[model samples]
Target: SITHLPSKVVIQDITMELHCPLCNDWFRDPLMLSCGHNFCEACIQDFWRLQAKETFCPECKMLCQYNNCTFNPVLDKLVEKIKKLPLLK
Candidate 1:
């Protein structure tokens, strides 16, 4: 019965390449900077704090005026959903 049973496992392949400025790896917590640049949430915060309000997008010189930019919860939820999906062997 076990061998004849239909496979319940489902693998989904949904890939979105996100480059993080700080670590230069795939973004973990993607955030949109005031300059419209995307970076990891923690990465951008750390970068801003380090420069002492002189924070700007690495790709572009557009200044980031916010001391702390708000996190995008919708993106976070989407990432979480992707993580929950089954992976291909």
Candidate 2:
């Protein structure tokens, strides 16, 4: 008798390293600011906490409009899966 197996296993890996300039870690709530810089939502908010009502990109000195940014949860989940993969090293 033969056992059954899943047809396919898709491994969607993300190569882009969208790291946070402040924490120097992987982006948690990845978001794109108006200036086109990607960062963790909390990180950016905290960085601009003191600023009356202006948000700026830490990596690039661009002034952020603080508009509603796009969240990339799929990419974040892929990154997490890649981190859990076994390596030959």
Candidate 3:
């Protein structure tokens, strides 16, 4: 008789950090405001465009200057990684 071994497991779940409050889902080209809040680039852009010149973080309500933001490379990478993972649909 041959011995049987356990199969590989792929049990993973998304973290809060992967979510953008503006989109309420995994971020796409996540942007990090000066206030340290994260949001999807398109979501924030649409919000600012609609509101016009008065943008603040949806999480803490701290003001986020339009020119003072950067793409969250870490979150961006994670989002891309998760999107290609089989564990996530």
> Which prediction has the highest TM-score against the true structure?
3
**lDDT (10s digit) by residue, model 3, range 6-89:** 332222335566888877888888889999988889999998888656788877888888899898889988877867766432
How does each model score on lDDT? 0.64, 0.66, 0.78
Better of 1 and 2 by TM-score: 2
10 residues in a row with least lDDT, candidate 1: 5-14
Clashing pairs in 1: none
Across 6-46, the per-residue lDDT of candidate 2 in tens digits comes to: 32322221334545667777778877777667778787777
Candidate 2 deviant stretches above 4 angstroms: 1-16, 51-53
- Segments in model 3 whose C-alpha atoms lie over 4 Å from true places: 1-14, 84-89
Report lDDT (Cα) of residue 1, candidate 1.
33
Ranking by lDDT: 3, 2, 1
Off by over 4 Å in 1: 1-19, 24-30, 51-53, 87-89
Per-residue error at 82 for model 2, in Å?
Answer: 1.6
